[PDB]
Amino acid sequence: IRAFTINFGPQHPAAHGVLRLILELSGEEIIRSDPHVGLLHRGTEKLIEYKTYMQALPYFDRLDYVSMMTNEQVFSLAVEKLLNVEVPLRGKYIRTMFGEITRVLNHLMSVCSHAMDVGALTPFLWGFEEREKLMEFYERVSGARLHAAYVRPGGVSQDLPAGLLDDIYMWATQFGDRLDEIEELLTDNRIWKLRTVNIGTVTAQDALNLGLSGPMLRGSGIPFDIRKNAPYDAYDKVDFDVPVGMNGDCYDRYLIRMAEFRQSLRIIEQCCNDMPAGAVKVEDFKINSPPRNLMKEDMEALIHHFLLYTKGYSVPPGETYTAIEAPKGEMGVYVVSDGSERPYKCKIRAPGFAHLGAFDHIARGHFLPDAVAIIGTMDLVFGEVDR
Amino acid sequence: NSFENLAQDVNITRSGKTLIAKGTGGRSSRTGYTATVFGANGFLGSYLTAKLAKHGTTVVVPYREEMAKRHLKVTGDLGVVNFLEMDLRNLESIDEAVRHSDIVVNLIGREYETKNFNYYDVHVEGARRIAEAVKKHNIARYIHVSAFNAEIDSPSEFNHTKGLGEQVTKDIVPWATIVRPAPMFGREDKWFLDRMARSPCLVSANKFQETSNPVHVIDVAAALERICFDDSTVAQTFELYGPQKFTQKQIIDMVSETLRKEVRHIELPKALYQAYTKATQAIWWPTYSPDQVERQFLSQKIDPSAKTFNDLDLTPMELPDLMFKLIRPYR
Amino acid sequence: SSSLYRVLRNAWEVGPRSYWKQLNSIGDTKSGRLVGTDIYGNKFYETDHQDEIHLRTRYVEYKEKDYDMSQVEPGWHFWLGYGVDTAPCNTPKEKLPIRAYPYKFQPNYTGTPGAFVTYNTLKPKISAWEPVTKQR
Amino acid sequence: GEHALRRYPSGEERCIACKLCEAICPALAITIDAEERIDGSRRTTKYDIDMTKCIYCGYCQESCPVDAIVETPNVEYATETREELLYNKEKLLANGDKWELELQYALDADAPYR
Amino acid sequence: PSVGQDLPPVGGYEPVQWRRNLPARGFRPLVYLAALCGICGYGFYRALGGIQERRELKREK
Amino acid sequence: KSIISYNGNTIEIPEEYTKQAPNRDSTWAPAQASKTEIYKNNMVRFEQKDLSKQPMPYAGIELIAQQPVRFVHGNTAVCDGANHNGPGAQGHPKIFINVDAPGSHACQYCGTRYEKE
Amino acid sequence: PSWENIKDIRLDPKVHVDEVYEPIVNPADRYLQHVSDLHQYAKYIMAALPKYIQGFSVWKDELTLHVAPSAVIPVTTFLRDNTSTQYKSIIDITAVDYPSRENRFEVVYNFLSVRHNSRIRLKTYATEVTPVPSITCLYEGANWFEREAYDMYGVFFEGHPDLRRIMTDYGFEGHPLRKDFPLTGYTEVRWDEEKRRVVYEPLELTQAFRNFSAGSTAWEPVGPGRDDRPDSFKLPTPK
Amino acid sequence: LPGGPVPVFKKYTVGSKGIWEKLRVLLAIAPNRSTGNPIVPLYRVPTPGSRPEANVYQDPSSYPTNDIAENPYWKRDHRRAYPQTAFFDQKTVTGLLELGSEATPRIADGEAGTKALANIANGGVSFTQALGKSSKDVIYGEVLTVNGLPPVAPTLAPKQWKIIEGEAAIYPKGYPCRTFH
Amino acid sequence: AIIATAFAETVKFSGSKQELQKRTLALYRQFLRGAPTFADLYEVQFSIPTIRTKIRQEFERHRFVDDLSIQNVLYAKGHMEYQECINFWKQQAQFLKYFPEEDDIQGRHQPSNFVDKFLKNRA
């Protein structure tokens, strides 16, 4: 009476994610779907109420583990909006262009992982290679790789090395060749064009009713981006085109991701030319640490260095919802300050949460291999959706 | 999470060591008993040290092979299960493995001779070699296991040597506690159900009428742990028999009625039966034993002067209640 | 690169006995210059040659057949993963951390009976009372 | 990567139990008891990292005024038991003995940018 | 103050390549079709003459 | 060497490892837990294992005691423990020591004892 | 003309200023002209639907609306349907408890006018017993969101197909984001060997959990703080 | 066109030799393509553990911040100068209607003005009663706009849109994605 | 996500105690009808009337609640657990939460008096 309904993936159906996903197939046609998420659900929100904002920061590079830095950024932005502080100029640009090399990383993982999920093996290695080149650029700034103990709610953890700003330009000249190269065997590509021409149409008002955002909403045709609609972090001060798709297909959702490499490289060209000088952390020693040069010399710097690492910094009461444009979509965060130094509550709006929630409105009628091309362009990394 | 293991909290052992089970009894808790189980990779041993480490007694596990030792780590917390290698030959390893053990058991029994061990080796000689060091170290609650039908008499050299090992355990460190269980059945038992689950031949003698009452293995393990810790077990022979005596035709028909298949039957006599089992010894994976031939004419000789399950407040289950579960996946 | 000419010419430069060892050791032909050796004894190299990809430059030749990583000295281990220009045989002694005790270099002994064991460093919290009777 | 406790020139343990490393390890991998020793100075009795849950925040490095625990850039220390993975004070002082060279090299490039 | 941190060059960097580097390489498609028919027809001229040759060899046998 | 394993049985480790340190045999804390207590606690997970390749980390109380006690011309000393080779901020923070009392005075971080002369 | 002849960048003159002159400013002035604008909108909303709005509030251009529990749908239609007020798009909803007060939970909504580039926030309240209705009648994606904040709190959404738990154990009892509910929960998991399956036994830790919020100042050390209320919309003094 | 194709001698890549370069110019899709390997004596030299720039590095700071003499902290304070969460009852908006505004008050007699305040501050009137009480100029002044129009849902910084279309676009026509900005 | 799953209903709150009682009665009939499906699906060791005598006594646990709306949340939780068990959504490990007492007879020395509590200081 019901279809012979299946379990899609216990372990390794879609790479980078545990996609348990009920499908009811009637002609190898999905009449309805029901993805059970919860398989990664660590319960992080219950934890982040018991730690200080000081300590609460590397919860979030665990969240959305392919684009750590936007999560870091959005929580730093929520707290800076909450604290009524202002990150300095150098801090604004350095956070901006790290949030754009992370965009390069995110689309470089996501497009190539989706091509592997479809079956194209060559970008799945050609992209992860340049991702290793970017692992190096996370490595020189902050800690190890893939989980940066970086942007603090006071701004930036620390300065660059002495020569990363040079070295990244040597990388940035050759990323264009290495990007157009993978563009050359997927964009025209009658196999890919066949598999992705009208697959999973997303109309405009239904894109709004499903709460979707980022490259998907911009693929449906609506020109909406937080970098340019409600700007911040000198995205005002950096010239930046935005791509907008035409149909509601997955092919616009592909082509916009191909375009954002070309855009976010132009970010780096306008950033590395015009990186200013100035204090990389916030100016005061009352929301982040003093530098370790002068705390061994000054009496005043010690008590700040101690209270920020025992109590932490005190936050005014209130609540904020700061949402910024993650490369997955609009990622939001809703923090409710006690007035204490632990956050009384903090919801995340993971971007892929509504993308997964909008699955079986899009996935009806399509085929089961067509039920894979729909997966990795709504980008269910599953670190996001449950938490 | 409660101590359903012990009677109490504070226990001095017989040798005078003080043991205080702190915490509330779960996996993270500690009980304090340092236990050692010889041959724990065997089929009784896995279920045994599972329940023994379920309440956090520190289980010293001597192993022989490095691969089968691994799937006993999961039943203990950090420091609960430990591992160390040894041979029956090297006495220093025996000496080492029992230095801090409060209690210790030995389920070493091999139903076939290797080219390096016979029954006289691994039943009466090695048990002497280990319980000598038990006597050397004043280790409390020593438990030895022997099989059912453990006589002094000839016709099964296995059973001839089991009673010899019993007499050696009674001789040296003479308060040692001897247990003789029945035939055992569990999920993948050694030769009693999985041999009856799949068999291309199903041939044995006697016309399938040897008699016993098989015990579920988890009941043996719970019985053993309830022995392990109290008083009123010292130097006492333990018949551990199932609730009702069976015959092999009864057993195999109970198996086949749930399989709903024709379990084959050949039942040829002893003469041609023996020489086929003679040639199987040269093969490295274990086959049916040429001395397992002899036990088919033997049956369960119950000693009336021993102590049952109802000594220690336990009632084991009946095989007809379990037959749907254990050979379920062969349906 | 990885052309036939490069592997041939570097094999012709090194020497066929060291080549026959190296092919059983690594899969490549690599010709360095002996920048320095280890206190454990491990010969290192560094490659001048122009046809090398990034971070293929410096490498180890071990001593033991049962090698692994973390058999190298720390002040080298930095340079093997390219932390410094100047290998520790050429550093000034001002950058040497002065120590008031000798050094031992345990590499790693995982699974080996020289494995590390843990214990709590401190005693139990509450000491008991010793039995001292009093004949009335 | 893995941890170590530095020492002074002329060899002194360098860790006082300020407990900042206990205070801001957001997985609570740090556990310290510490007593006043014979001479009267404060030293650590038991210093213990639970390396099952050392999450490589590196905040524990940035939290020491006297710069005792550091981040040794070793990663090749893969163990076979969880028992091996509980680094007490002795293993960390052995690592501070071992990697002392490289930790000097790293702080000669980071102590400005700290 | 600010000293020792990294800065851009005072001359700045060169402008990078961020467009679609896609040359429409090759020939006109009609050239591919005409070359196809040329390779074909020359092959047929070698084929059918050899077939009639083989038929005359068949007669000779 | 031979210590009682809670049962009258003795366990026997060499005197090279009944030591708090290669520099010191004796304990230096009220809850130091000497190795004679430690093997007495869990030799269970110490059998079949090497005795050599554990840390023995060269304890500090012997090393600090043989550093020369420095002299200060004036009244108030300063201690940093910082190198003058390392380009950064190392050592313990700049605390000061009054040295007036008869006897030396250890700087409570670095343990270097100073004397007024 | 070749890659051997390319210049380096590591040796060149770079820009080198002696001391940057960064002016100081409170980062709230840039909001203010808009914020005083926003109030005029917000008061309008209360004049628009006085039956259902208990109040409005705003703090640094985040507009927050105050709706009774049985009052959600008539507001959200108007927030969707008006040409002057078209938010069209749920973003995230969740709940926050305040067990000090009588109505325990409060339910918060976030929208995003993609035409007019604006946000709006809608707070209602509900005791754990009583419901709030579902906005799944209008907003289609919201049924997933409402499925979330069910399990974390127990707060209902009446009028909702597919109401069931998500992002927790299926056999879980209780609710995680609830201040009485402990951190580690009640049940932990281990593989029992003898049942050949995993069993759910109650909690035992190796290390007891240690918060450190016991060290805390009672008064919140942030001050009273100035206002940014518009001079139109605070009360005129008498005389 | 300011970011178009540049030739491969300005790309910082391992390149080629010179007869094989002459080979691969004839055999490539575009000649100006990097093989992806960075140049070894340029990229990541000297190593970040040994940087001569790192030897002298004190602090980045700004002039009104690091000024020791002139400022106190409380002038450059930012945490204790946060705006208050402006809350508005149903009732205080009725206060905003009839009692007026600090721009244009409607209340004289400051003694009895408190009495006229306080019953509304206790709930003497209702809001819809005030709406009927509010004049056409009152509604069109402080509720609606001066044309009597509803206020547009206001935005922080309205970003008007261009559409780049021609040869400066990131895709020519046929490709469905446009590049507005 | 226009459409529901197979057995999921729109949640709706009965205004009367009788309508709640009608829904609970239908619900117990649904459990009792689907009970032989469960022993097949979750492959359980034991028999179907043991499932039935648990499903009876679990509603016996909550027979004596006064309020309408607390029985309303209680009914909704029961309907969700029905929704889980009627599909493959719970697994047999999570399905066997409901029988801790059946699978193992407890063990020696279950404390009953004061003394057996006291000798292990109440476990």
Ligand SMILES: NC(=O)C1=CN([C@@H]2O[C@H](COP(=O)(O)OP(=O)(O)OC[C@H]3O[C@@H](n4cnc5c(N)ncnc54)[C@H](OP(=O)(O)O)[C@@H]3O)[C@@H](O)[C@H]2O)C=CC1
């Ligand atoms: N129904 C039955 O099977 C009956 C059996 N028993 C006895 O109960 C005990 C356990 O039962 P069961 O599980 O079925 O049999 P086992 O599988 O446990 O017998 C083999 C076990 O003992 C070890 N063993 C045998 N010889 C040696 C040796 N030289 N050196 C080291 N280890 C050795 C084995 O080592 P390894 O792990 O490397 O294989 C293995 O652990 C046995 O002693 C058995 O004789 C008593 C009554 C009924």
Ligand code: SF4
């Ligand atoms: S890096 Fe390690 S020591 Fe530091 S806070 Fe994290 S877990 Fe703790």
Ligand code: SF4
């Ligand atoms: S290493 Fe640092 S944080 Fe840790 S105990 Fe020592 S001084 Fe404190």
Ligand SMILES: [Zn+2]
């Ligand atoms: Zn000092």
